[PDB]
Amino acid sequence: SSRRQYQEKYKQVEQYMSFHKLPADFRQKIHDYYEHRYQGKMFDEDSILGELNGPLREEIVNFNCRKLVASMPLFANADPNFVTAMLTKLKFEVFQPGDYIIREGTIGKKMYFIQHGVVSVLTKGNKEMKLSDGSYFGEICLLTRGRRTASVRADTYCRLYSLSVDNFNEVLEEYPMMRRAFETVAIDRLDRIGK
Amino acid sequence: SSRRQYQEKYKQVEQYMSFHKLPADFRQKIHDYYEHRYQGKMFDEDSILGELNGPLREEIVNFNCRKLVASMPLFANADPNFVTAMLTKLKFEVFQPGDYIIREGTIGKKMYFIQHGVVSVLTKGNKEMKLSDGSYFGEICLLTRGRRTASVRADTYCRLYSLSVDNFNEVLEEYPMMRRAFETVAIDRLDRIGK
Amino acid sequence: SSRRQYQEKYKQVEQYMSFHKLPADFRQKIHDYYEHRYQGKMFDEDSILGELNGPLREEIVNFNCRKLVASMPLFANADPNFVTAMLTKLKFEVFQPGDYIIREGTIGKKMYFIQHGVVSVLTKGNKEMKLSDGSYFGEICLLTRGRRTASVRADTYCRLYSLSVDNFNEVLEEYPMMRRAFETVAIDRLDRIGK
Amino acid sequence: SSRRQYQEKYKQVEQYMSFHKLPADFRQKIHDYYEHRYQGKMFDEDSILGELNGPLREEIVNFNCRKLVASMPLFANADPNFVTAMLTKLKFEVFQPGDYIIREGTIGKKMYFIQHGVVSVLTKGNKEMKLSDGSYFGEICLLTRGRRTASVRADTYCRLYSLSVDNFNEVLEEYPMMRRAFETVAIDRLDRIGK
Numbered sequence: 004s005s006r007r008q009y010q011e012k013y014k015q016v017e018q019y020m021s022f023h024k025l026p027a028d029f030r031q032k033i034h035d036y037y038e039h040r041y042q043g044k045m046f047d048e049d050s051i052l053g054e055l056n057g058p059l060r061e062e063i064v065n066f067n068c069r070k071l072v073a074s075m076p077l078f079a080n081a082d083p084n085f086v087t088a089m090l091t092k093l094k095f096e097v098f099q100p101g102d103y104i105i106r107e108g109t110i111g112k113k114m115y116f117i118q119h120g121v122v123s124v125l126t127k128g129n130k131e132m133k134l135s136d137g138s139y140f141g142e143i144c145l146l147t148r149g150r151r152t153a154s155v156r157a158d159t160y161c162r163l164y165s166l167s168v169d170n171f172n173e174v175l176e177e178y179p180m181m182r183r184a185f186e187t188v189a190i191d192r193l194d195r196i197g198k
Numbered sequence: 199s200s201r202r203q204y205q206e207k208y209k210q211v212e213q214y215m216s217f218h219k220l221p222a223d224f225r226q227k228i229h230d231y232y233e234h235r236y237q238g239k240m241f242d243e244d245s246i247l248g249e250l251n252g253p254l255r256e257e258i259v260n261f262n263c264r265k266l267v268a269s270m271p272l273f274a275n276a277d278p279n280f281v282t283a284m285l286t287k288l289k290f291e292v293f294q295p296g297d298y299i300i301r302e303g304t305i306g307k308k309m310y311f312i313q314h315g316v317v318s319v320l321t322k323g324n325k326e327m328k329l330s331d332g333s334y335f336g337e338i339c340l341l342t343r344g345r346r347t348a349s350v351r352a353d354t355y356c357r358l359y360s361l362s363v364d365n366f367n368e369v370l371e372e373y374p375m376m377r378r379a380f381e382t383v384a385i386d387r388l389d390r391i392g393k
Numbered sequence: 394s395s396r397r398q399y400q401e402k403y404k405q406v407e408q409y410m411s412f413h414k415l416p417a418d419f420r421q422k423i424h425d426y427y428e429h430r431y432q433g434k435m436f437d438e439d440s441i442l443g444e445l446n447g448p449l450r451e452e453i454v455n456f457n458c459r460k461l462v463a464s465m466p467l468f469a470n471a472d473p474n475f476v477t478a479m480l481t482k483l484k485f486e487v488f489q490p491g492d493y494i495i496r497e498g499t500i501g502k503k504m505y506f507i508q509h510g511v512v513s514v515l516t517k518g519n520k521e522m523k524l525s526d527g528s529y530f531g532e533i534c535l536l537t538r539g540r541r542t543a544s545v546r547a548d549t550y551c552r553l554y555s556l557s558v559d560n561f562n563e564v565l566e567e568y569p570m571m572r573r574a575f576e577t578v579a580i581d582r583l584d585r586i587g588k
Numbered sequence: 589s590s591r592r593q594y595q596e597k598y599k600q601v602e603q604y605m606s607f608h609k610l611p612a613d614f615r616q617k618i619h620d621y622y623e624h625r626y627q628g629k630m631f632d633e634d635s636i637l638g639e640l641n642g643p644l645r646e647e648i649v650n651f652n653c654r655k656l657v658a659s660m661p662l663f664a665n666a667d668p669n670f671v672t673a674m675l676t677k678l679k680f681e682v683f684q685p686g687d688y689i690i691r692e693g694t695i696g697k698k699m700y701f702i703q704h705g706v707v708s709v710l711t712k713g714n715k716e717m718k719l720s721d722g723s724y725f726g727e728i729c730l731l732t733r734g735r736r737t738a739s740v741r742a743d744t745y746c747r748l749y750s751l752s753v754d755n756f757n758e759v760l761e762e763y764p765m766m767r768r769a770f771e772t773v774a775i776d777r778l779d780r781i782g783k
């Protein structure tokens with residue numbers, strides 16, 4: 004039944020690609036994205052969660068994110084109520100190899116937690132660094148309100164969870180002691196890239 | 199026919215739970231919630247009320263809330279036009295036993311009127327107090343813009359009506375004399391919990 | 394086909410009324426409203442007009458409102474481009490006999506143009522006055538940002554077009570010379586009701 | 589299948605026109621618009637692009653707009669990342685011969701890039717000028733926050749891409765060096781029309 008709803012949606016994407024005469028390799032790339040992102044199933048997730056209440060939604064995001072939470076010290080060792088407030092504002096995103104998730108110099112308005120995948124952190128000239136499952140990136144712009152200090156490129160398929168600057172700020176107003184945890188990491192990174 | 203629309207919606211929830219591999223007890227808890235919240239029937243309530251006008255919507259909320267109004271002195275003894283302005287901005291919510299409706303220390307942005315159910319008011323150390331049909335809670339944060347002064351936990355299934363801080367403020371701009379009614383109760387409660 | 398879409402929508406309203414156990418006279422009142430408001434036909438008007446462009450939407454509202462425009466000196470004698478800017482922001486509303494469209498003392502945020510119907514203007518004590526096809530009301534609050542100076546009650550079924558304070562202000566920023574036309578009428582009315 | 593979705597949508601437009609008793613020539617004009625705008629096919633484009641990610645959406649708009657980009661020096665010779673930020677915020681619009689896309693004296697909040705078509709630029713008295721594929725108009729109001737300095741009328745069917753003032757400002761905050769490119773053209777035009 005879910006296999007069916009994904010099928011009808013994907014048919015519309017196919018029609019969109021056909022109308023716009025997208026090339027063959029591009030259509031395959033979009034197909035592969037859809038299979039990785041939705042895994043052959045689709046539901047009106049916003050309508051469903053909207054029909055619930057706060058406690059149920061909170062129990063669901065905690066259950067779904069058990070591995071993300073336990074695998075990242077920032078979350079694992081934090082007040083579970085801070086963790087819940089973060090989890091409720093995360094957006095699942097999938098990226099493909101070679102995607103520029105972040106471009107250096109742009110104005111950043113979201114950060115990313117890596118559930119699964121490897122990314123390259125690229126700066127003018129300081130040797131590529133890598134981040135994987137359990138790490139996060141894009142926090143510096145959220146803290147500074149300035150420009151991205153590096154590009155971040157997917158090496159693999161990446162399952163990420165994003166957090167918008169407005170949501171990051173709302174949570175940190177509620178849990179101001181957690182602001183320093185991010186600030187400490189941002190400062191260490193700014194030092195390491197010397198800029 | 200309504201029995202039918204609830205059935206199709208609930209099938210989607212079942213599919214969501216299946217995809218996310220939620221445990222058996224959790225799936226039952228979500229089923230029980232849905233039966234209590236929607237009572238086997240569903241309609242596009244927002245579309246319906248949207249097709250009406252102000253007078254009809256006002257007549258409907260007044261009719262539906264006759265018992266809530268008559269059972270709560272704040273409403274029963276107030277200008278019926280204030281009562282209508284409140285009723286039009288209430289959101290029906292259902293909570294299950296053990297749910298933390300409010301957590302102490304968090305930043306509150308809504309209050310609750312109890313149509314039916316019992317809740318426990320819990321503070322660091324002052325002996326649990328109980329609130330039931332005809333009472334309300336969560337007003338203090340709405341008045342102070344500060345942090346919740348207690349946790350409130352459902353003891354029973356609870357049928358509540360919530361009111362957002364923005365809506366509470368809009369109504370009280372129109373009916374500023376009613377602001378003191380809430381302030382008096384908030385002050386009495388802050389005294390009783392000594393903090 | 395439109396007769397069909399209205400039928401399916403109205404069935405949902407019937408189900409809503411049944412679920413909430415609304416009284417017989419109330420259900421009839423809602424039926425009569427629906428027949429007067431939609432005249433047995435329904436379409437997704439917002440989706441349709443959304444698919445068009447500015448020029449087509451403007452040509453449509455002008456065509457539909459030819460009688461409203463020609464029957465009201467404020468519009469008939471104005472810059473047709475001001476008239477178009479007003480017409481595009483009007484919302485069709487239907488009221489039934491006895492409805493309080495406006496209540497004295499409330500904070501007003503919309504005004505009304507009467508396409509067809511009769512209303513009574515009611516103030517503490519100054520003798521009921523009547524307004525009909527070609528007139529408008531609710532402008533004073535829009536101009537003053539204060540409280541309604543009278544109640545306005547439908548005597549008949551009324552076909553009205555409303556204009557929100559924000560839309561009224563946006564149009565009058567573009568066409569500031571038209572602000573005085575409304576101000577002159579508001580002042581004359583404030584004089585007549587002496588308050 | 590897309591031919592089918594356009595057919596069902598157009599039937600609703602036909603029903604809307606019938607209900608409002610629009611004249612024959614007007615109904616034909618709306619039919620011709622729909623054929624030019626949608627070319628007999630329709631999909632939920634917002635839902636589709638919403639299911640993708642940033643990189644895919646960016647690859648799609650770049651592919652679809654290759655000719656617009658290569659045919660306009662402002663884009664062709666710019667940082668491709670600026671171009672992408674512009675392209676992602678463009679809205680496709682179709683206008684018909686004689687449409688007033690912009691009226692002199694009004695408060696402007698969007699500019700237009702011409703993919704295909706010819707427009708006339710009309711001012712009080714300075715001889716009509718023409719703009720075509722590869723040019724843009726409506727930038728001056730975006731820069732000045734004042735009133736339109738000319739009317740712009742479609743001579744032909746026009747395929748345009750619009751950009752809102754808020755989006756224009758957001759992009760130019762990110763790419764402030766591109767602000768001067770528009771300012772230089774605006775100044776040259778203000779000189780030429782002497783006002």
Ligand SMILES: O=c1[nH]cnc2c1ncn2[C@@H]1O[C@@H]2COP(=O)(O)O[C@H]2[C@H]1O
Nearest residue numbers: 111140141142143144151152153192195
């Ligand atoms: O030395 C580093 N080791 C690991 N990560 C790093 C390092 N330097 C930068 N980053 C990440 O790259 C992001 C680019 O966007 P941002 O400026 O908003 O935040 C940055 C950091 O999260």
Ligand SMILES: O=c1[nH]cnc2c1ncn2[C@@H]1O[C@@H]2COP(=O)(O)O[C@H]2[C@H]1O
Nearest residue numbers: 306335336337338339346347348387390
């Ligand atoms: O002594 C009390 N008797 C009954 N209720 C109480 C008492 N103390 C607090 N409360 C309620 O608990 C809420 C917690 O959220 P809040 O801070 O926004 O508002 C509080 C009050 O409504």
Ligand SMILES: O=c1[nH]cnc2c1ncn2[C@@H]1O[C@@H]2COP(=O)(O)O[C@H]2[C@H]1O
Nearest residue numbers: 501530531532533534541542543582585
């Ligand atoms: O003497 C009057 N003759 C006709 N109309 C009048 C007179 N007095 C008031 N009104 C209308 O009643 C409205 C009540 O809402 P409002 O205060 O926003 O604007 C008022 C006027 O439009």
Ligand SMILES: O=c1[nH]cnc2c1ncn2[C@@H]1O[C@@H]2COP(=O)(O)O[C@H]2[C@H]1O
Nearest residue numbers: 696725726727728729736737738777780
């Ligand atoms: O001399 C001119 N040659 C070509 N175009 C011109 C000239 N003068 C004005 N325009 C365009 O007309 C628009 C009217 O709206 P706008 O004031 O926001 O921006 C204007 C310019 O883009």
